[PDB]
Structure formats: structure tokens, C-alpha cells
């Protein structure tokens, strides 16, 4: 049961609280699938700096990212819109906040809504279940 606490570069899947697997498809677009096979949910999480990571859709060579505006998107080239701040909330779920872009002082979080739809950064909230994710081992 422990192998989830292992490794530097980690291959994981991010299951949203809204029961969706965050995926990034070849067209660059970010969304959450409900399938268990969609090979666009196989993310490659890596540390860029203490507490900060780079989530990569291992197959569509896209880095999960957030533009200063507040919209999810995946660029083939790694930039500062890719640096995500990973944190463990008090409910066992993870939250991925933009390391750079903020708004109205609050932080913007990567999030999926009721139906795998990418939420708007500005409208997301740390404590709101929309931004929780259960990282899942893949091997």
C-alpha cells in the first residue's frame, strides 16, 4: 500500500473529488474523463522546487498549466504557467495551485466541476471540493 510514497519522478493519475481523472488531450485541451483507461490521465508529476511541481500528460506531451488569466491549458514547452504548488488538504485530497498567477489576492486552483469541465482559476477556491484531487499510483 506504501508505494504511493515512493520515488522522485512519479507516474500518477489525478482523480478529482468530482470522481474524474484529470486528462490532457492531444488537442492541448484540459478536461476530466471518467474512464479508467484513457491514456491521457497518466500524468508524470515531478518536483521543480520544494512544494512546487510540474504535472505532465505523459502521452500527449502536454504540461498541465495555468495562464495569468486563470484558465487551464497544456503547453508542449514547460513555462511558469506550468509550475503548480502541490499541497495536502485536511481531507486527504491534494490541491494544485498556480505558483505564479493569483487574483483578488486569493490563489487560483486547478479544478474540475460537476462534469469534468475545467473551472476558471479566478472562480476556484482552495477549500471548495472542486479543486481536490486524489493522486493515484500507476505502474
Amino acid at each position: 500500500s506504501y508505494n504511493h510514497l515512493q520515488g522522485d519522478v512519479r507516474w500518477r493519475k489525478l482523480f478529482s473529488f468530482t470522481k474524474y481523472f484529470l486528462k490532457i488531450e492531444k488537442n492541448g485541451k484540459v478536461s476530466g474523463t471518467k474512464k479508467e483507461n484513457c491514456p491521457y490521465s497518466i500524468l508524470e508529476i515531478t518536483s521543480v522546487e520544494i512544494g512546487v511541481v510540474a504535472v505532465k500528460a505523459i502521452n500527449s506531451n502536454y504540461y498541465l498549466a495555468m495562464n495569468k488569466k486563470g484558465k487551464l491549458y497544456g503547453s508542449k514547452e514547460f513555462n511558469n504557467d506550468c509550475k503548480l504548488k502541490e499541497r495536502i488538504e485536511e481531507n486527504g485530497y491534494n490541491t494544485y495551485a498556480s505558483f505564479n498567477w493569483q487574483h483578488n489576492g486569493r490563489q487560483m486552483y486547478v479544478a474540475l466541476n460537476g462534469k469534468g469541465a475545467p473551472r476558471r482559476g479566478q472562480k476556484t477556491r482552495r477549500k471548495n471540493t472542486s479543486a481536490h484531487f486524489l493522486p493515484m499510483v500507476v505502474h
Binding site: 522522485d8 519522478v9 482523480f15
Partner: protein, 209 residues
């Protein structure tokens, strides 16, 4: 008088479901059939009774759902629902996996890195296994020199970061040293840290002349 059949088969394509502890799980098997088929829940084959998990559970007959509040790790397993009327019966099973998040500073396997020896010119590596739920940042620090002085004006050592975690390293847990030059001898520190805390252990490299 139709024997039991499923309603929204779409919402039943997921066989595996996971959740971190202390959260809530709701299992469903929307069914229909005439007359009204009954629903029964089994946990790993055995009948699933209220006295099985602390605080039992609730069944939303109207919704054909099983609800467990604040799941614990012992709630791990297969949950089979059995819908039926006198004219037949159908079922479906979900595999609930309860996860336990370990929010602490990293902890390293003992004994690693391990000391090493090598003929000048040879090769060598320094492994360092890591345990950390929250993404860990690994960095191999070593003591070096700046302008012939081993220490800085503050009296602390000059440190050099031989390798850290990132986009250019597929494996910071291992540090290979190719063509070991004599000067490579010394202590190689391995420091792993996450947003909560850090840990660090070292080993030694001896280069036989």
C-alpha cells in the same frame, strides 16, 4: 412483471473507486423491474450487515444506493449489490480502495547512501531511497572550495548542489559519478525535502590512487 434490469448503465461502468480516509462513499445500482426488485449488499462475498462497520451505513432504497460515512481503512474491499424480484436477479460489484495520506517530512531508507570505493577513473553511484506522500524535492549537496578557502566569511562551508529534482533529471534518487577523479573523494550528502520538512543522510567516496 419484468425481472430486474438496470436503469442508467452509464453510471455503472466504473468498477474501481478510491477515496482518502475520513471521506464519504456512495455506491449505487439504479434498477427497475416488476415487481419492485429488492436490493442487497455484500462485502467480499459475505452478507453486509449494519453491525459490520462502525456506525453501520444507510441505504437509499429510492435511489438504490449504499452510503458509508467517514470510511476507515477496514472498509477496503469489494461491494456487491444484488437486485431481485421473484422472477430473477442481477448484480454488480465495486472495488472501494481507502487511501491514507501521510503528511509528514520525508523519511529516508536507512543505510542509503552507502559509502563507496573506486580506482581513480572508475565509476560509482550513490542511491538514496525516499518516502514522502507530498512530492519530495531531492538534492545531492557536497562540500567544495572557493578560491582556496574551504569556508566562507560567515564561517559556514561552501556547498555545491551536484544534482536536484526537476525536469532534466528522470531520477534524483540515484547519483552516478563517471570517471571518478581523485578530487571526487569526500562526503556526498543527500537531502530530501517537501513542503512540510526535510531529512538528510550522507555516505563517503574514497578514490584509491
Amino acid at each position: 412483471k419484468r425481472a430486474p434490469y438496470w436503469t442508467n448503465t452509464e453510471k455503472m461502468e466504473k468498477r474501481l473507486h478510491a477515496v482518502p480516509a475520513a471521506n464519504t462513499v456512495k455506491f449505487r445500482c439504479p434498477a427497475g423491474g416488476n415487481p419492485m426488485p429488492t436490493m442487497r449488499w455484500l462485502k467480499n462475498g459475505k452478507e453486509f450487515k449494519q453491525e459490520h462497520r462502525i456506525g453501520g451505513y444507510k441505504v437509499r432504497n429510492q435511489h438504490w444506493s449504499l452510503i458509508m460515512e467517514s470510511v476507515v481503512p477496514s472498509d477496503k474491499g469489494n461491494y456487491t449489490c444484488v437486485v431481485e424480484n421473484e422472477y430473477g436477479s442481477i448484480n454488480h460489484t465495486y472495488h472501494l480502495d481507502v487511501v491514507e495520506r501521510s503528511p509528514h517530512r520525508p523519511i529516508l531508507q536507512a543505510g542509503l547512501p552507502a559509502n563507496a570505493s573506486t580506482v581513480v577513473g572508475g565509476d560509482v553511484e550513490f542511491v538514496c531511497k525516499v518516502y514522502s506522500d507530498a512530492q519530495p524535492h531531492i538534492q545531492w549537496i557536497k562540500h567544495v572550495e572557493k578560491n582556496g578557502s574551504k569556508y566562507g566569511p560567515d564561517g559556514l562551508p561552501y556547498l555545491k548542489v551536484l544534482k536536484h529534482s526537476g525536469i532534466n533529471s528522470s531520477n534524483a534518487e540515484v547519483l552516478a559519478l563517471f570517471n571518478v577523479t581523485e578530487a571526487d573523494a569526500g562526503e556526498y550528502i543527500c537531502k530530501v525535502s517537501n513542503y512540510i520538512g526535510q531529512a538528510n543522510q550522507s555516505a563517503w567516496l574514497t578514490v584509491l590512487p
